[PDB]
Design a binder for this molecule. Sequence first.
Ligand SMILES: *[C@@H]1O[C@H](CO)[C@@H](O[C@@H]2O[C@H](CO)[C@@H](O[C@@H]3O[C@H](CO[C@H]4O[C@H](CO)[C@@H](O)[C@H](O)[C@@H]4O)[C@@H](O)[C@H](O[C@H]4O[C@H](CO)[C@@H](O)[C@H](O)[C@@H]4O[C@H]4O[C@H](CO)[C@@H](O)[C@H](O)[C@@H]4O)[C@@H]3O)[C@H](O)[C@H]2NC(C)=O)[C@H](O)[C@H]1NC(C)=O
Ligand SMILES: *[C@@H]1O[C@H](CO)[C@@H](O[C@@H]2O[C@H](CO)[C@@H](O[C@@H]3O[C@H](CO)[C@@H](O)[C@H](O)[C@@H]3O)[C@H](O)[C@H]2NC(C)=O)[C@H](O)[C@H]1NC(C)=O
Ligand SMILES: *[C@@H]1O[C@H](CO)[C@@H](O[C@@H]2O[C@H](CO)[C@@H](O[C@@H]3O[C@H](CO)[C@@H](O)[C@H](O)[C@@H]3O)[C@H](O)[C@H]2NC(C)=O)[C@H](O)[C@H]1NC(C)=O
Ligand SMILES: *[C@@H]1O[C@H](CO)[C@@H](O[C@@H]2O[C@H](CO)[C@@H](O[C@@H]3O[C@H](CO)[C@@H](O)[C@H](O)[C@@H]3O)[C@H](O)[C@H]2NC(C)=O)[C@H](O)[C@H]1NC(C)=O
Ligand SMILES: *[C@@H]1O[C@H](CO)[C@@H](O[C@@H]2O[C@H](CO)[C@@H](O)[C@H](O)[C@H]2NC(C)=O)[C@H](O)[C@H]1NC(C)=O
Ligand SMILES: *[C@@H]1O[C@H](CO)[C@@H](O[C@@H]2O[C@H](CO)[C@@H](O)[C@H](O)[C@H]2NC(C)=O)[C@H](O)[C@H]1NC(C)=O
Ligand SMILES: *[C@H]1[C@H](O)[C@@H](O)[C@@H](O)[C@@H](CO)[C@@H]1OS(=O)(=O)O
Ligand SMILES: *[C@H]1[C@H](O)[C@@H](O)[C@@H](O)[C@@H](CO)[C@@H]1OS(=O)(=O)O
Lengths: 390, 392
Amino acid sequence: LDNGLARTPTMGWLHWERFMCNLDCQEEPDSCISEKLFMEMAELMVSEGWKDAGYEYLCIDDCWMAPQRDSEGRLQADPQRFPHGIRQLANYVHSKGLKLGIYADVGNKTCAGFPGSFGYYDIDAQTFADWGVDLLKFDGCYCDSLENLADGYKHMSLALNRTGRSIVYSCEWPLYMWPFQKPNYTEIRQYCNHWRNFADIDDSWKSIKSILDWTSFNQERIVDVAGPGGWNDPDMLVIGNFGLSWNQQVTQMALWAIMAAPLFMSNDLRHISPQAKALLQDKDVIAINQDPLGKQGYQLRQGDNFEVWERPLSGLAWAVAMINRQEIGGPRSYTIAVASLGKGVACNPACFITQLLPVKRKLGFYEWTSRLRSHINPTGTVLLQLENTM
Amino acid sequence: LDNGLARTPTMGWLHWERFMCNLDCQEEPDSCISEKLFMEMAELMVSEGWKDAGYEYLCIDDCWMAPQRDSEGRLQADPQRFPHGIRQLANYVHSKGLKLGIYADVGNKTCAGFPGSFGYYDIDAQTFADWGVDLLKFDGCYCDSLENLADGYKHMSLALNRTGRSIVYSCEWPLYMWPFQKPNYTEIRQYCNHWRNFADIDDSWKSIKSILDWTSFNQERIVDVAGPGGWNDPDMLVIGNFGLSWNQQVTQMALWAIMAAPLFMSNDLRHISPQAKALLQDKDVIAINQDPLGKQGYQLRQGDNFEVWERPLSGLAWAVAMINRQEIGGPRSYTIAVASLGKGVACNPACFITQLLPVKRKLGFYEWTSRLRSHINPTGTVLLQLENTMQM
Ligand SMILES: *[C@@H]1O[C@H](CO)[C@@H](O[C@@H]2O[C@H](CO)[C@@H](O[C@@H]3O[C@H](CO[C@H]4O[C@H](CO)[C@@H](O)[C@H](O)[C@@H]4O)[C@@H](O)[C@H](O[C@H]4O[C@H](CO)[C@@H](O)[C@H](O)[C@@H]4O[C@H]4O[C@H](CO)[C@@H](O)[C@H](O)[C@@H]4O)[C@@H]3O)[C@H](O)[C@H]2NC(C)=O)[C@H](O)[C@H]1NC(C)=O
Ligand SMILES: *[C@@H]1O[C@H](CO)[C@@H](O[C@@H]2O[C@H](CO)[C@@H](O[C@@H]3O[C@H](CO)[C@@H](O)[C@H](O)[C@@H]3O)[C@H](O)[C@H]2NC(C)=O)[C@H](O)[C@H]1NC(C)=O
Ligand SMILES: *[C@@H]1O[C@H](CO)[C@@H](O[C@@H]2O[C@H](CO)[C@@H](O[C@@H]3O[C@H](CO)[C@@H](O)[C@H](O)[C@@H]3O)[C@H](O)[C@H]2NC(C)=O)[C@H](O)[C@H]1NC(C)=O
Ligand SMILES: *[C@@H]1O[C@H](CO)[C@@H](O[C@@H]2O[C@H](CO)[C@@H](O[C@@H]3O[C@H](CO)[C@@H](O)[C@H](O)[C@@H]3O)[C@H](O)[C@H]2NC(C)=O)[C@H](O)[C@H]1NC(C)=O
Ligand SMILES: *[C@@H]1O[C@H](CO)[C@@H](O[C@@H]2O[C@H](CO)[C@@H](O)[C@H](O)[C@H]2NC(C)=O)[C@H](O)[C@H]1NC(C)=O
Ligand SMILES: *[C@@H]1O[C@H](CO)[C@@H](O[C@@H]2O[C@H](CO)[C@@H](O)[C@H](O)[C@H]2NC(C)=O)[C@H](O)[C@H]1NC(C)=O
Ligand SMILES: *[C@H]1[C@H](O)[C@@H](O)[C@@H](O)[C@@H](CO)[C@@H]1OS(=O)(=O)O
Ligand SMILES: *[C@H]1[C@H](O)[C@@H](O)[C@@H](O)[C@@H](CO)[C@@H]1OS(=O)(=O)O
């Protein structure tokens, strides 16, 4: 989407995976979908170094809406859970130097069953613009035809543009289409800053493996369309929650960097281990995700329960990720000719290799003739940066 | 098995899940199955508090053997990887205050393809005894028929007995029967100090879920046969490795205590986080696993991706485990009438409740009529100890 936004993949925080549709503010005031939750996260994004590391969009997912539109036909914030309303929440988030994301649905209801935007695309767009919203995530539920799905995603895209406000447009057009026909990604990119391809992430290693496996299977169709203003969205970072080992968290952070994914944390910034925080705030790894060239990486190889992925970077650098998919035993040895990496140019005539994950370690100078040898933890990833000597 | 051993579930370390059948000492020396791996593991069991906590048995799994029996038809330690032999490793292990486990197979070859024990039960049993072996793990690969399987396990049991050495006998008889017919656990219990029921664990939450789901589904068949001298074996603790979140690790330790499981760590004691170490050495959870009453716990309730397990302990005390099987969102609230726990006994007329996992927290006096309110992490477990009391 040529709106001048998402020139690098969008970074921030989204409530869905961790906080879901929790409407019980009486029995659970700290966990419920409320403006207090979003203000708490806004304060911590400033105070705990998130904004400084580049996490900039504080995003509301589903279940923020009143059950009905107003007399004037507009979407409303739940009067109890969002009593000051979205415009006022946007004002607070802006005062902290952050941006606000909100959620709507292309169909007749949101997925969780609140007002759909079908019939209301123009008003909803102008409502969001008036409220000071900086990002829209547009989910795909309760849409009766591919025709309505396409027209809706395009119509909301054009309606956002016409408001005159810079609003990042996050689409789920491919995801909701894929069961019925192959999406046209060239067309999707013309209308969307990023697009969900695949099933919702959850707090599990199974979920991460299924996202990587879908992405490597479909890479011919999706890798080349990605670039400044338009990204494949493999869904939220779940680092800092309950379901992932350290090595599985490292795999998610490393491969979300290789894939030039939007980095939307869905965690509790009030309760996050130092280790999870330092991984998510990892400057070198965010610098890979945020590389201004914006060329999506890809799977180079798969065999013997190993994966090699690589991403071309600015200035003749490459990122290389090596995944151990064997979930038994100890750190497993993998070796690859450096001449096989970055299409033959990364290490011709030589490259300096730095390991970034699981720990930062200079590995030294590798000649074009060299083999890189590494031990990779089960369900873990080794992330390397290659700098060509020339 | 009435050999006076395994009156509580056996505790120790077994190499299999973490080191497997790594024979490449040239290119993977730190991972390979060698005497030096076992010697170094023995030193760390002493120096890093493992023996103190109850982990007493240092056990060799498959791939210790020479490819062939000697001229006198006895088994041989691999000459390159075990050049000083089992006898001397047994001496080293005994010198540190620990006991040595070894492995063999009821059939013609070990599962990894080394010399099987069929035709040699008596000589192999005497070999282990002369060697100073304190435990045998006996896999089921390469067995012709149920008659051979059953005949072998029964044979090796009496063979080990006929040596007059105390040797914990660890059988996979049930596990290698399931593809043919349902096991008879009273027979198995007569011959074996513990028995593998289900497929090998690996370093994954999927593996843990699969072992717990098989256990709860099958609990009426297996829970009551367990007791001092004979235990259900749900396979090794894999805490300290790579595949489990903190919450999934707490779930394994909590539920292995509930199930009166033998506790065989399969990890690298040279490279283990303080957090995994503190969980595996947790005195209060080991004390549940090792409760002298020795009655195996069970799943009380399932529904809404929650599980409630409980285990009766000596002295009218109960352990209660609450598992959140929802792999999304945040900590979920679960409430239950204390009356519904410990068959209504635990908290009649009151109990004192101590949370043990994920952290140790005195919760206080609960009257028989009162409710217990908890919050359980996704893939995590809250483990509680209920002490029957007359106070409050
Ligand atoms: C080869 O196979 C045979 C059986 O096939 C096996 O022999 C059996 O060995 C076991 C284990 O030692 C024997 O069990 C012990 O039996 C003695 C004697 O029991 C009889 O006589 C007593 C006299 O006191 C009577 O009261 C009783 O009713 C019996 O008729 C008992 O003294 C032993 O009990 C102690 O240990 C038990 C655990 O095994 C406890 O349950 C019990 O409470 C006892 O106390 C324990 O804890 C105490 C804590 O203070 C501690 O102080 C004690 O020292 C002890 O640890 C036990 O029941 C069984 O009798 C043998 N059976 C037969 C048929 O001979 C061989 O052992 C086996 N050989 C090898 C090497 O594998
Ligand atoms: C509404 O849709 C139009 C059509 O794409 C958007 O126009 C495009 O806007 C971008 C971003 O401003 C333009 O590129 C930029 O040009 C400026 C000024 O020269 C430059 O400084 C930037 O570095 C960048 O190259 C882009 O050329 C332009 N396209 C067209 C056809 O005019 C517009 O941004 C959208 N507006 C909103 C509110 O979304
Ligand atoms: C949101 O809900 C509305 C109202 O239920 C949907 O409008 C209805 O959509 C159906 C298509 O499935 C239309 O039915 C068609 O009508 C013609 C006759 O005019 C008939 O030949 C077709 O076979 C079919 O039955 C229906 O006319 C239409 N109703 C109105 C009031 O417009 C709407 O499509 C839903 N939107 C999404 C995105 O699901
Ligand atoms: C380990 O391998 C040995 C060598 O193959 C096995 O010994 C064999 O045992 C089988 C019984 O399952 C014997 O088969 C029978 O042979 C007789 C005729 O000799 C026939 O009447 C029967 O109908 C049946 O075919 C076999 O004879 C015997 N060995 C040899 C060399 O003939 C042994 O069973 C294996 N052990 C285990 C525990 O699996
Ligand atoms: C996929 O979608 C794209 C964009 O809508 C289509 O490409 C356009 O096709 C028309 C007719 O060939 C051209 O006028 C435009 O130049 C194209 N736009 C761009 C930027 O390429 C393409 O036709 C669609 N492909 C398929 C197979 O349907
Ligand atoms: C399982 O095996 C055990 C032990 O071999 C059997 O126990 C026998 O039970 C009968 C009574 O039905 C006793 O009279 C015997 O003395 C017991 N022992 C033996 C060695 O036979 C048990 O019956 C078997 N269970 C089933 C259902 O087959
Ligand atoms: C649509 C999105 O795919 C998901 O990320 C989230 O925004 C919810 C909101 O309701 C919805 O997915 S769901 O699978 O229908 O819950
Ligand atoms: C048999 C046991 O079940 C397992 O724990 C281990 O001891 C190996 C030894 O080779 C074997 O299982 S396997 O699935 O055949 O590897």
